Amino acid sequence: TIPTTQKAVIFETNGGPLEYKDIPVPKPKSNELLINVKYSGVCHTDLHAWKGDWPLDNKLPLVGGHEGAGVVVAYGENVTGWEIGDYAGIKWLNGSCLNCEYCIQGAESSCAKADLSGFTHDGSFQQYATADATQAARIPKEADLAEVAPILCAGITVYKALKTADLRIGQWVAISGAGGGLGSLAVQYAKALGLRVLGIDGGADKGEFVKSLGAEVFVDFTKTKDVVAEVQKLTNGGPHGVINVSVSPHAINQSVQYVRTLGKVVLVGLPSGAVVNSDVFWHVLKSIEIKGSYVGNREDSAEAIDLFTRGLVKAPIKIIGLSELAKVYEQMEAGAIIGRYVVDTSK
Amino acid sequence: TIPTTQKAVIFETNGGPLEYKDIPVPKPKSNELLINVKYSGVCHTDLHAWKGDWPLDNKLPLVGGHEGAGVVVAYGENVTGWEIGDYAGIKWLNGSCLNCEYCIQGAESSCAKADLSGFTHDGSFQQYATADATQAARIPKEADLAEVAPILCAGITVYKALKTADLRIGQWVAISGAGGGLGSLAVQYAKALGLRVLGIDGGADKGEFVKSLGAEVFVDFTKTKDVVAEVQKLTNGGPHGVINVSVSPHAINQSVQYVRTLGKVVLVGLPSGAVVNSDVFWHVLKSIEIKGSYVGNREDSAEAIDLFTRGLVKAPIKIIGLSELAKVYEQMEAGAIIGRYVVDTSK
Ligand SMILES: [Zn+2]
Ligand SMILES: [Zn+2]
Ligand SMILES: [Zn+2]
Ligand SMILES: [Zn+2]
C-alpha cells in the first residue's frame, strides 16, 4: 500500500526555506528500491548541502538527508536479491557506475558519476525515497531502524577511518574529539578492532565517558598544557595511528606531531578552510603517512553495520519529528553542538 | 543498424555437431552491452566447454567463446559509462551477482552465480553477443581488436599468475611450459615486470624461442636428467617464484621441489585429475607457498591490456573465419601442434 503523496523537508534554492510539505512519492527506476524511510539521521553534511558551501554541484529542488533506515516497499523490474519488507539503508553514496577506475578498486564514492543522497539525489528526509539496489545497505531485521540510522554515516565513516589507519592488534590509536558523537563511535569501533585507545577531548565529563567506552587513557586538553608531549609519553613514543575526528585545525596539526615513528595520521570529514601543516624534515625522518579517509564501500558498510547489530557499538539518539527538522538545520547553522538527532518521518 | 539474425557456431549437445548457422541476435538486458564481436580468440577452454569435460554445469544449446573483441552497438537502460562505438572485450566472466561476499571483495569470478561466456552464457563465437556492462573490458581505440582478443584470456591469466607469485624486481621466476602459447606470453609479461626468467620446456626449438623472448636461461626437459637439480643450480638455490603454465602433474611436483626457500609456487589452469604432492617437512622447513591463480579481476585486466597496448607483450595470431571454427575444435580435440587462432566473425 504505497501512497501517491508524502511529507518531506525540501528546499528549492540553496540557503532557501526548508519547507515541510507534501510532495509526490517517487517511482523507482529499474535498478532502484523504493524505501519507506522510517527514520533518518542528520549531520552537518546536510547543512552544507543546503547552504551550497561545497564546490560540488547539488540538485535543486532537493530533499536532503543521507542517513535513512526504512522498509523496502517496492523495487524496479530489474532488481534482484531484495524482497518486499526487507530493511534497507539509504547512504551518502546512492549509486555509482560500478565499472570505472575508482569503482573497480572499491572506491565507488570517488566515481565521477556518483549519485549522492541528499545532494544530487533526493535523500532520506522524506517518507519514500529511491536508492540503487546494489549500493543500499542491508539492515538485519534484528536492528532498530532508528538506532541504526546514524551508523549509516558516522559509524561506517569512523570504521573506515580506522581501517585506513591500518593498525595491528595491540597497537595504539589516538582519537581526537573522543567524547563527541563521532569520536565516541570511533572509540567503540577501535575497541572492536583490538586497539589500545587514547582519547583526547575537553573536560572531565567527556573523560569519564570516554573511559567508560573502553579507552585505556584520556588526555583532557582543558588541563594538559602540552598535549603533544603527553600523548607521546603515554603511548611510549606516540600512537601508531590517529583518527582526527575533531576538525579543529589545532588538533589536526597536533596529531601530525604526536604520531609515532612510522605512524598513520588519518583525516576524516569535510571541513571548511581546515589545513593540515607538516614539517617535511620530520615527516620524512619519521616516515609518517597522512591519509584521507572518505566513505566506506559496500564491504566496509556490511562490517560496520554488523558490529553495531552485534551490540559492540552504541549510538544513543534523540528522536524528533521530520516536521521539526528545520530546527536542527538552524542549530547546525548557528553553531551550538547538540546530540544525535533522528527524525521520525511519520511526525 | 542492428540485425535480428546473425551467424554463429553453436552446439545443442556436449560433443555434438558444431554448426555454423543463423541464430537470433540477442537483446541486451538492462545491465548488458550488445557488442558486435569483430574477432574472437580460441583456446582449449572452448574445447572443454563443448566436450563437457569439466565438473561444472554448462548450458545447452550453447554459443562458445570467451575471448571476444568488438564494438558496442547497444546497451540496456541501466548501463552508464559506456557509449556506442566503444571497443569492448568479452571475457570468461560475463557477469556476477554483485551482492555476495566474493563480488563485494573484488573476487567476482568466485561468485556462485557467475555467468561464464561460452559456458553458461552465449559467448564470442557469434557476431553479436551480450555482456554485463560491469564486467566488460574497455579496449583502447589504439588496440587492434584481433590482436588484443587473446590477451583477454591468456594474457590476463599469466599476468595474474605473476602477480600471484608476488615477486620483487630482479628475482627469478621459473616458467614451466615456457615455449607454448600461454608460456611465451608469461615470459614476456615477466620480463616487463623486471624479473629474471628461467624457462622450462621440451625441445631445442622451444629453447631458441624462449631465449628470443628474453629468458636468461632455458632448461630442456628432453635433455636434462635432473630438472630439479639443474633449475636449483642455475638460480643459485631455486627460483623465487614458479608459474606452472604447463598443467603437467610431474612438472608441478618438480616445481615444489626446486622452488627457493620462502618461494611461491603458482598453479594455473583447470586440469583433470592433476594432483600436487608436497612433502610437509620440506614445505614447512622452506616455508613455501603453493598458490592457485584463477582469472584476473578488472584491475588485473586493465593492467595486462595496457601492457599489450604499450607494445610490451605480443601474441602472434592466425586469423581465420568464424565459419572455419569447427576445424580448430577438431584440431584441439585431436593432438595439436598449431598456433593461436583468432576467428573473424564476418567470414
Ligand atoms: Zn551524515
Ligand atoms: Zn564508477
Ligand atoms: Zn581462452
Ligand atoms: Zn556474487
Side-chain angles (χ1 to χ4, degrees):
Chain A
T1 315
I2 300 170
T4 304
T5 295
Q6 57 160 337
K7 291 298 176 188
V9 178
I10 178 170
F11 49 99
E12 302 177 16
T13 64
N14 281 114
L18 301 160
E19 303 189 319
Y20 175 74
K21 66 174 178 187
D22 288 338
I23 67 176
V25 169
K27 290 314 302 164
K29 299 168 61 183
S30 173
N31 62 305
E32 291 177 335
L33 310 172
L34 183 63
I35 296 160
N36 174 214
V37 179
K38 296 303 188 179
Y39 298 96
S40 176
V42 189
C43 79
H44 271 70
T45 294
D46 302 310
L47 175 68
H48 294 287
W50 167 54
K51 292 300 208 168
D53 292 322
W54 287 347
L56 308 162
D57 297 326
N58 72 88
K59 176 180 148 287
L60 291 173
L62 179 54
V63 180
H66 60 282
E67 318 183 358
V71 189
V72 175
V73 301
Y75 51 80
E77 58 183 14
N78 295 123
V79 173
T80 73
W82 288 91
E83 288 178 339
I84 303 297
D86 288 349
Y87 291 172
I90 176 159
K91 303 178 294 184
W92 177 242
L93 184 66
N94 194 280
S96 65
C97 81
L98 301 176
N99 192 9
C100 71
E101 74 180 292
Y102 300 117
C103 285
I104 71 173
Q105 311 174 51
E108 286 99 334
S109 55
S110 290
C111 183
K113 295 182 176 180
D115 300 330
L116 303 176
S117 301
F119 206 92
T120 67
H121 181 117
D122 281 0
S124 49
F125 294 155
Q126 61 193 324
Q127 303 174 301
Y128 296 82
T130 56
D132 173 278
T134 300
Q135 297 293 161
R138 309 277 172 161
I139 296 171
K141 292 292 176 71
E142 297 83 357
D144 186 308
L145 296 179
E147 290 177 358
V148 66
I151 302 302
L152 300 175
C153 177
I156 295 168
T157 293
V158 299
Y159 177 71
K160 176 62 162 189
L162 286 157
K163 290 179 68 170
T164 298
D166 192 32
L167 307 174
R168 305 179 58 186
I169 289 159
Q171 284 187 336
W172 282 103
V173 65
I175 299 175
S176 86
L182 200 53
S184 56
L185 277 178
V187 174
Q188 295 176 74
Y189 276 105
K191 293 299 291 174
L193 294 167
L195 306 175
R196 297 174 70 181
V197 174
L198 180 154
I200 305 168
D201 215 322
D205 53 342
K206 297 186 193 170
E208 180 178 353
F209 177 47
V210 170
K211 297 272 188 58
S212 75
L213 300 174
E216 180 171 337
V217 167
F218 180 79
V219 172
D220 186 336
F221 64 71
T222 72
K223 298 173 175 178
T224 303
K225 187 177 174 168
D226 190 342
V227 171
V228 169
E230 198 70 11
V231 170
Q232 293 172 318
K233 286 185 214 71
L234 287 161
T235 61
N236 301 319
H240 304 80
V242 182
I243 312 305
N244 283 284
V245 170
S246 168
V247 295
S248 158
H250 186 61
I252 292 168
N253 283 324
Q254 287 180 333
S255 80
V256 173
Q257 293 174 307
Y258 57 68
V259 71
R260 209 182 190 86
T261 300
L262 302 178
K264 277 58 61 68
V265 176
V266 183
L267 303 174
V268 188
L270 297 174
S272 292
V275 176
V276 60
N277 310 114
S278 182
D279 185 299
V280 172
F281 179 97
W282 292 107
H283 197 136
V284 167
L285 181 61
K286 291 169 63 180
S287 297
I288 293 166
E289 315 178 12
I290 304 177
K291 308 176 67 182
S293 188
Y294 184 28
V295 292
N297 63 25
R298 289 172 296 156
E299 195 179 19
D300 307 319
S301 297
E303 295 161 11
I305 291 168
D306 185 54
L307 287 167
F308 167 77
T309 64
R310 292 165 59 195
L312 303 179
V313 181
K314 293 182 178 300
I317 55 167
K318 301 177 64 181
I319 297 179
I320 66 178
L322 174 59
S323 53
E324 316 181 59
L325 176 58
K327 79 171 175 163
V328 182
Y329 275 87
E330 300 176 20
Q331 294 298 282
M332 292 193 295
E333 181 183 12
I337 311 173
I338 312 160
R340 188 181 292 108
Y341 287 112
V342 174
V343 298
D344 177 338
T345 64
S346 74
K347 310 172 176 193
Chain B
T1 317
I2 300 171
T4 78
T5 295
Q6 58 159 336
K7 291 298 176 188
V9 176
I10 180 170
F11 49 98
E12 302 177 16
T13 66
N14 282 115
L18 301 158
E19 302 190 320
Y20 175 74
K21 68 172 179 186
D22 289 338
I23 67 176
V25 168
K27 288 313 303 164
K29 298 170 62 182
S30 46
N31 60 305
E32 292 177 336
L33 309 170
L34 185 65
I35 296 158
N36 173 213
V37 181
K38 298 304 187 180
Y39 298 93
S40 175
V42 188
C43 81
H44 271 72
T45 293
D46 303 309
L47 176 69
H48 298 288
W50 168 56
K51 291 301 207 169
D53 292 322
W54 286 345
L56 308 161
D57 203 27
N58 74 274
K59 178 185 142 209
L60 291 174
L62 179 55
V63 179
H66 58 281
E67 318 184 0
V71 187
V72 174
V73 300
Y75 51 79
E77 57 184 14
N78 294 333
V79 172
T80 73
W82 289 91
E83 288 178 339
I84 305 297
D86 286 348
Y87 290 172
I90 300 177
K91 302 177 293 185
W92 178 242
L93 184 67
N94 193 280
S96 66
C97 83
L98 304 179
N99 314 307
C100 70
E101 73 181 287
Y102 297 112
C103 285
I104 69 171
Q105 75 183 274
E108 290 96 337
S109 55
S110 288
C111 181
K113 296 178 178 176
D115 303 328
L116 304 177
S117 301
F119 204 87
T120 68
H121 179 116
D122 280 1
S124 50
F125 294 154
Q126 61 193 325
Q127 302 175 301
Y128 296 81
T130 57
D132 174 278
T134 300
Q135 288 294 324
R138 303 175 192 274
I139 297 171
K141 291 291 176 70
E142 295 84 358
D144 185 289
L145 296 178
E147 289 177 357
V148 67
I151 304 302
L152 299 175
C153 176
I156 297 169
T157 292
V158 300
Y159 178 72
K160 173 60 163 188
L162 286 156
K163 288 181 67 169
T164 298
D166 190 30
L167 305 175
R168 309 291 190 90
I169 186 155
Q171 284 186 337
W172 280 102
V173 65
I175 299 175
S176 170
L182 198 53
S184 57
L185 274 176
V187 174
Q188 294 178 73
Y189 276 104
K191 295 302 291 174
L193 292 168
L195 304 174
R196 296 176 159 92
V197 174
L198 180 155
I200 307 167
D201 215 322
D205 52 341
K206 294 192 187 174
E208 178 184 54
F209 178 48
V210 170
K211 297 273 188 59
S212 76
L213 299 174
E216 180 168 337
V217 168
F218 180 80
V219 171
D220 187 337
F221 61 69
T222 73
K223 297 296 287 297
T224 305
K225 189 67 165 167
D226 192 342
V227 170
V228 170
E230 189 68 8
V231 171
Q232 290 170 315
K233 165 175 147 172
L234 292 165
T235 58
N236 190 35
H240 304 82
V242 55
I243 313 305
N244 285 285
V245 169
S246 166
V247 295
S248 159
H250 195 61
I252 291 167
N253 283 324
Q254 285 175 328
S255 81
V256 174
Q257 291 175 306
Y258 59 67
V259 71
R260 208 179 190 82
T261 299
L262 304 179
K264 274 64 59 68
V265 176
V266 183
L267 305 175
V268 189
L270 297 174
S272 295
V275 177
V276 57
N277 312 306
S278 183
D279 182 297
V280 172
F281 178 97
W282 285 105
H283 199 136
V284 167
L285 185 61
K286 291 173 64 178
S287 299
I288 74 162
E289 314 178 13
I290 304 176
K291 309 177 68 182
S293 187
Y294 186 30
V295 292
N297 65 26
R298 292 173 300 161
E299 296 181 81
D300 307 319
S301 178
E303 296 161 13
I305 293 167
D306 181 52
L307 287 166
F308 165 78
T309 304
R310 295 168 61 196
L312 302 178
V313 301
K314 296 181 180 301
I317 55 168
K318 301 177 64 181
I319 296 179
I320 66 179
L322 175 60
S323 53
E324 318 181 60
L325 177 57
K327 82 167 177 162
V328 183
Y329 276 95
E330 299 176 19
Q331 293 299 282
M332 290 192 295
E333 182 181 12
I337 296 174
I338 313 160
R340 185 182 291 108
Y341 286 109
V342 173
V343 298
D344 177 338
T345 64
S346 74
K347 311 172 177 193

